[PDB]
Design a binder for these strands. Sequence first.
DNA 1: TCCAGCCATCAGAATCCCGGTGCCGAGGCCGCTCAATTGGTCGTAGACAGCTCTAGCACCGCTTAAACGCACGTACGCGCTGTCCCCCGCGTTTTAACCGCCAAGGGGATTACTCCCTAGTCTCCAGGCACGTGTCAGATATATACATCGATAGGC
DNA 2: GCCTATCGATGTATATATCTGACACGTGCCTGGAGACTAGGGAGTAATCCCCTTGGCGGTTAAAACGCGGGGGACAGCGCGTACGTGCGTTTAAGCGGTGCTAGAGCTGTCTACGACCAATTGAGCGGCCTCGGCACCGGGATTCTGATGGCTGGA
Lengths: 5, 728, 95, 93, 86, 78, 108, 105, 97, 97
Amino acid sequence: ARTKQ
Amino acid sequence: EEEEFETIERFMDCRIGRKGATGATTTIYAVEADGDPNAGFEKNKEPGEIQYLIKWKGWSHIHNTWETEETLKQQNVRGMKKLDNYKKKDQETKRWLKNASPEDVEYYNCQQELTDDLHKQYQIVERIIAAAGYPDYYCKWQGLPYSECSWEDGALISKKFQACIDEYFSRNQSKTTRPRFVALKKQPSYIGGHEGLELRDYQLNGLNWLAHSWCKGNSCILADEMGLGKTIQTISFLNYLFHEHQLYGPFLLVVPLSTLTSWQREIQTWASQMNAVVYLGDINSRNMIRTHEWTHHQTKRLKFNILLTTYEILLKDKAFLGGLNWAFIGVDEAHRLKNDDSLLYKTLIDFKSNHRLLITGTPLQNSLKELWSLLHFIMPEKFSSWEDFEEEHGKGREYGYASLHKELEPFLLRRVKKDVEKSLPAKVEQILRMEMSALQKQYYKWILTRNYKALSKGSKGSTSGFLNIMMELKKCCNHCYLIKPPDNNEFYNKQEALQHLIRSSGKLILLDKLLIRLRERGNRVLIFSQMVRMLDILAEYLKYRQFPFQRLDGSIKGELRKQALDHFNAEGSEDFCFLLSTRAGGLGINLASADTVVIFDSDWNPQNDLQAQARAHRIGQKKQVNIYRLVTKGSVEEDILERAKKKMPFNKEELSAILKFGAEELFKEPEGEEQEPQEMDIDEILKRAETHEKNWEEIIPEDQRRRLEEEERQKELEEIYMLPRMRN
Amino acid sequence: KTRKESYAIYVYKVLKQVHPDTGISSKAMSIMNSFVNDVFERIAGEASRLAHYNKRSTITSREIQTAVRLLLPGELAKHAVSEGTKAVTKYTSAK
Amino acid sequence: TRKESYAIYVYKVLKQVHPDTGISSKAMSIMNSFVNDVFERIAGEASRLAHYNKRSTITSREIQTAVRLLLPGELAKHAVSEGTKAVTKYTSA
Amino acid sequence: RHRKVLRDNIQGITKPAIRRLARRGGVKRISGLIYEETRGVLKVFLENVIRDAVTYTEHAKRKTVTAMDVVYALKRQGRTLYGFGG
Amino acid sequence: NIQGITKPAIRRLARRGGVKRISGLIYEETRGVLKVFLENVIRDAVTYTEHAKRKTVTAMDVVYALKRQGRTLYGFGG
Amino acid sequence: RAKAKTRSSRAGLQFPVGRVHRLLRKGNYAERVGAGAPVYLAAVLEYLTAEILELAGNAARDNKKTRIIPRHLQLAVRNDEELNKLLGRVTIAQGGVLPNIQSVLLPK
Amino acid sequence: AKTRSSRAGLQFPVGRVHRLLRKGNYAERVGAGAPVYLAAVLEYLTAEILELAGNAARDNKKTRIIPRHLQLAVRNDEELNKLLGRVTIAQGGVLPNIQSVLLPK
Amino acid sequence: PHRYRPGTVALREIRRYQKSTELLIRKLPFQRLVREIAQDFKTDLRFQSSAVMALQEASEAYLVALFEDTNLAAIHAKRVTIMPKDIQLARRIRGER
Amino acid sequence: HRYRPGTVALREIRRYQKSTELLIRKLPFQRLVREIAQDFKTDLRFQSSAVMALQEASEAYLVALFEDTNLAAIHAKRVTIMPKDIQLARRIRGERA
DNA sequence: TCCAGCCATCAGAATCCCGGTGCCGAGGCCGCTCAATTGGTCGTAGACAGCTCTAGCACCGCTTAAACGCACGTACGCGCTGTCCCCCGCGTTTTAACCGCCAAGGGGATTACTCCCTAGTCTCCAGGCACGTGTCAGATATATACATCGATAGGC
DNA sequence: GCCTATCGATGTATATATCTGACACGTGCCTGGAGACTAGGGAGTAATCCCCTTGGCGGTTAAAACGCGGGGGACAGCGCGTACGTGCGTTTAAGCGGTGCTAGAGCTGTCTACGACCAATTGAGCGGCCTCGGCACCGGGATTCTGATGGCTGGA
């Protein structure tokens, strides 16, 4: 996943 | 693929909130997920924190993170130097905001309100630019140029607006991009839109014009009189080839940057079933346009229905935009194309295009070469030269009026205000002719007696000689202070300035009651004058009257000029007056917010008066427009009007006679001082006003010329003699 | 043996105006006769470059005033222009 | 309208010194103004020399003595020799 | 606002511009107080040159300061400039 | 004949100029600068004398020699 | 004919308007010399001479003499900052220099 | 044959210099030999500067004399630099000269 | 990281800008400053495009000569940095008041 | 007794700054003029007022040159003028490059 | 108790000032002659007006080169100390500048005749300036190579 | 310890490929240069008077020269820190251009009035002479810095 977790 | 960490981008945020915030709490995707851990906070109630979290590099505003800002230093993020700049700019910010005038403080509050909304509006997507489909949903945000387009995994955008965006994503697969006479003039308003019923009869006839013109194969110049027909009827006409006929070639519309937002908003509201590649931005933005949206399907099978580009960008990328066989080229404000030496004109000519339309907001009265250029752009054939045209354009013939602006087959609408408007009350140009005040009479006498030595030449004089004198005397039609200002030591006393104003300016005695009557009613006022210095007097006068007002002249910077116009045009505008100028008529501004206008000055060209009226005669006005013009029985403009009415400052003999007839006899007669012809203040002028839809030695009382020649020879002699022979 | 003209007599009248009691030695006269000649050759020199740039052919009071304006520094210019204007006015206004 | 200038003559001199070299527009303006200024210096010095000796005519002798005053030591010798060559040929032809 | 129209225009001859001019002359190290002295000097140079040009313009009954007027202003002060006319 | 510009003579000139202490090599530099300055002025003086077809070099010629180099001298006639 | 009256007397100046007109016309300054030019030029020359004479006499009273000597003109010209800017290149014979010593050289 | 330039062996205009001397108000008379003398001096001074500037153009491997080729000519020559010492040449630059004490060692 | 010692970049700038004849002062702010000074003498003055060009050439050439004199003045004091007193000394020797 | 170094120098400064008399002797300066004019034209004859016109132009040039030299020597934080001070003044004035 | 900052008094050597006394250099004054002013006229320059069109100021949008800010650190400005001989003050021996006077003749300043070069003007013809045009030179981008410089490591 | 050794950059420098806008060249013609002439006078030349420069001499004495002591300023060496440089970063506005407008630079045709040229005559300014007062020179003493010598006492 690219998003910031 | 992925990349490394640890970089800041930009600081545009400032807030106060509860400690312990994590993620993106106030963003819409996080609001749905967690609501807000900061919810219920108050600045003083709870031990919270004054945050200013940051916009992060490599991530969008939808990914704008909120955290405990101690974590920022805890990650050793590059680019902290912008944080120090933020404090110093903010620390300067409050030092100005806390001490500025409350009007300016609230103005800055409105400027902030526009600011963060513009910042909030960046979050909303506009289109995804179609291992997940078009992988990771490469998409555009509102406001940012195409350069800032980025990716999403389908985990936060999939929830927010992908429900309707998938319908636009599905539109990608949708298939998109001469006949006889057509059954026009039906009622197609159902095709207009989801509330597409607002088309008036004249707008429909304009569409019927455009369709008829293409059925004949002819081209069009949309010479509408700067009404609403600029955009609404133009974009709707492109539906004729797409939504009725499905003959959907590629359409170009080159619109100026100032009006691009309007064109891009109404291409979606009306003709919603359309796609629009806005060709704006830096070279990166246009590169993203070409690789990702220009030809979705395959080579040369264009997928854009319409594209909007500024005139500035069309010259930069003339090659790529000109390589396509265009079905339609549209140019807005087309008076830029009035010159064949223009690079835009020369480059737009070479664009191969099936149909061509020009939108203009002027009656395009200018000489034959402007029309010849415009006619050449819409029709490159059968209008190529004067040699094949002289038989028709040959002026000076009364029988030629049957063709001049009448017999033009490349039709222009030229459809005037008087044709479309059918419910506006009648209009009369009020002329408040009156006698001259005592101060004006003395100054008018001062000017005339000064220039006797020039006037003696008569027919052997100079046209420029008279024009200076007439320009000088026009300062007496305006109030005295253009000639010699009043004494500061007395004028500064507001305990006496009110008497100074009312005694000097009889022109306000009737307006005073109208001002109060309409201020209780809620009206607004616009004022016109040629002399910028005379406008300065009005600004000072208005500052003394303390009515809110605005000003518009060529010395104002662009940002302040636009905001001043927008302040008066905003809904519920509170400003009462507006110092206007004639040259603003070319900007397309709107004057419908004010129904009362005063023509304080006079002008030598009726075209300027027409330009002032054209921006106020808005279609759909229900009230009767209030207009007043001032005449002072001197510098007789009526000497022009009686002659002008046969065709609506030109002949040396006439202009000399104007001075000999204007103020022919009421010079400094021995009648004496304190004549004070004031006695027509009210209800005299209202009832009695009409309405409609010798050599100088014989003339001038030469006794004064002794009194000036023997005193000026004294003024300009002490000014020579009043300096010591020696220093110290 | 031959007339050699100099500004001794007029400078002496000017000295007897500003300072009626003082005198001037024979060598300060040579400095005075040279100072006036130098200022003449400077102002009239400029009044020859002016009225040639303008393609005129005559030297006038206006060009002499412009030369004085260009040549004399600071406050000396204003008094010089004022004195020239006074002399011109007195010549034109009387016979 | 005609703005007379030394433009045609500088090119002839350049074509005699360096037949292949040419001259740019702004360098021509310097050379045109160079001719004018050294013209005015020699003429003014010639004017003052004539006035100093109670003379009304500006002759080759006046021009020679002004060149000897304005130009440096070797340029003066070269210029005087060229000037005396031109004048001696003009009286013979 | 960060800047105002308050006739600070002489500060548009910046540190870089004064530094480049010094570097063309041959200066290797420049003290921080050189810039104010250069700005003061440059204003004094321009005031004298501009005044003469304005005097020639006023004498010509003209309103536009020309290159010929500027060259004649420099020619007085022994600073003859070639390139613009003569 | 240049050494007739004596060492005390150079000292007196420096005192008028405000110099308090003089190095032992100033004198030769002062002599060279004076020789150059005279070789400039006297060359012009002889040029004026030659032009006039005269042998005696005059004060008027010398003041013209200084006037061409901008050291205008008052007291002699120029 | 009418009895003569010199142009210098009409304008009030003491300097000779006749001589200045002759010098401007027999000096090849221009092809024509305006009738208002000699009157102006004499006025400026008279003023400068008066100013210099005033300062020279003012120094003469300080030096306790009653005749103007070369030294006083040097004192006059060099003290007045404007006349010094006009005569900066000028050298005055028998004039001397301004009394001035740099403060670094003074004893301590 | 019918021009004074061709009689003197000169390329510069004898006649125009005569016109400028007469119409420039230097003296009441201009001798018939003064224009010949002055034009001959003008040509030599231009020939020297053009020669030095063309030498600099060859050294810079160009073909056209540009302003810095004139500047590099005037300042190098000890005598032309003395004639044009107060002269400023537009677009002329300055000659490379770094003082010996500033170069490091 | 590679970093030149103090003086190396100074010399290269000396070499580059002595070789180049291009303008150093920016045209537009110099034009604005010229108009400011002139307006103190006569208002509403127009300036030809070449007049400001002539002013800038003269101004730059004067400063470069002043900087040469200033550098020589500083070196006489056995220094390498130019200081305002060097400019003052250079102007006083040159004769500017 | 003996005055200390400097007291006599300042007394001489005030004496020679008050006086207007010439400092270089007339006859040994007259001979130097005759010797320099020897190289330009033989059998020349000099007027007294033209030998004196050269004298009062020589002395007033060294005196101002010596003032500039003193200014340059005080600049280097020195009291004594040196050949390197004369050459710097003459290089800044433009008489040598 | 000490070096040095702040003093007091004094013998000596200046510069300043006053009274005095000669002389020569200015300040008037008489006569005279050249030039300045008055009166008239002629014609060519510039003042004035009516005009066209080159170019300057102004707006507005792009783009990116360059201004502006800050930050480490290293080279240079500035004080200080010591020492060493270059300069100054001065006494005395010495050279020659200065002045007054003398006599000779050089060449400077003029006057006067005369004639050749130069101004003024008219007919003339050809040169050089202006407008147009087109090919190539040197400005630009880009590419590899070739120094120039300075951190790091071992030799003596 | 101080020397010098190869190497990793990283800006000049050098190539070769494009191309645009500017220069050298073309024709036309209008204005100016030139030829043939005549006219007054400026500059040339011979003669001449004598102003003044130059040559020499001999006193006088002022100032130059030369040498001695001593001190203070030049200048090398060292050290400490405030300041400038180099460089990365980033926010302002220069530069380019396109387009527009209209003020004001350039020109042409007309008329007049202002300056030059002219003849006279008259007093203002030049030269030469003269005679008295300011200061040039001088003896002199009241005054004023100035270097040596005897005198508190601070921070230490």
